[PDB]
């Protein structure tokens, strides 16, 4: 139930028709990584966490940036023991179109 970490590459401010990576990782061995967007059209994307050396990460790929993919992005993680129970939400990351 420990909050994971969320980052945006190359950054949170994106240009139109450009792809970004929203990396979600934590030292806890999270098996499922869920990214939730809050905005004009809320959505919840799923990605299986890949447990590399030390951390389990997930590279969320937000495609060609439209005004619909902009909003507040928070990240969650869960264990297959109960995919129902998510963890604490990560710190919110605001993605805005340039």
């Amino acid at each position, epitope marked *: 139930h420990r909050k994971p970490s969320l980052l945006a590459h190359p950054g949170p401010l994106v240009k139109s028709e450009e792809t970004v990576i929203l990396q979600c990782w934590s030292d806890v061995r999270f098996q*499922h990584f*869920l990214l939730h967007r809050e905005g*004009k*059209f*809320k*959505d*919840t*994307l*799923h*990605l*299986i966490g890949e447990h590399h050396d030390g951390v389990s990460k997930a590279n969320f790929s937000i495609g060609p940036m439209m005004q*619909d993919l902009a909003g507040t992005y928070r990240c*969650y993680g*869960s264990v297959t023991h*109960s*995919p*129902y*129970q*998510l963890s604490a939400p990560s710190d919110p990351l605001d993605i805005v179109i340039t």
Partner: antibody
Amino acid sequence: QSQVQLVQSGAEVKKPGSSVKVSCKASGGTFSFYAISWVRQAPGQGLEWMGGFIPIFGAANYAQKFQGRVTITADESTSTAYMELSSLRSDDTAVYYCARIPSGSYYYDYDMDVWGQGTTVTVSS
Amino acid sequence: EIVLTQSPVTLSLSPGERATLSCRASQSVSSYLAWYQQKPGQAPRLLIYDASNRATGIPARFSGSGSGTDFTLTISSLEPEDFAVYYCQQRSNWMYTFGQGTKLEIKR
């Protein structure tokens, strides 16, 4: 194409003004981070959405026409889903369906939709 | 609340012809649009998800298109098994409202 399969409760006959609770048991998986959507089709009519439940967010979204008489829930195991309809009217005589669909997008690892066999509920005096 | 309206009501086409179905939304759902097919006597089957992506196992003759308020389901080379009822359903903002539907019948 998903390994998950859904089985619903048997048919029911209720009187006008009573309540009915239909169950949706999942096999080969759990509702997990997906959403539970219930739909109804009356004889000759089309598909009518009743509402949905996303267990991970503890969120229940319902349709205005059923808001107030409908309740969608699930077991802590997230293996059995339930929809209870109160103030039953004859217009509620239809076949009710339960579906395991994604909360929104089917982005990346999301299995295709899985429906149940359906449940015929007849409300008549 | 967003109301999905489908056109036409009944489509009378012949085997081998190209079919076009339209789903119009009162407010934008932005590719959160699903297409279902109900053959009489059976439950609905998912055909197109996310407005344009074809479901697993669906023949390539079915195609999805549209974003926002207008959506189109194209079935080229209508195979006799395709004549049924087709519904569109929104999947935006946790609301899964259905369309009225469209009957695809055989024009003889």
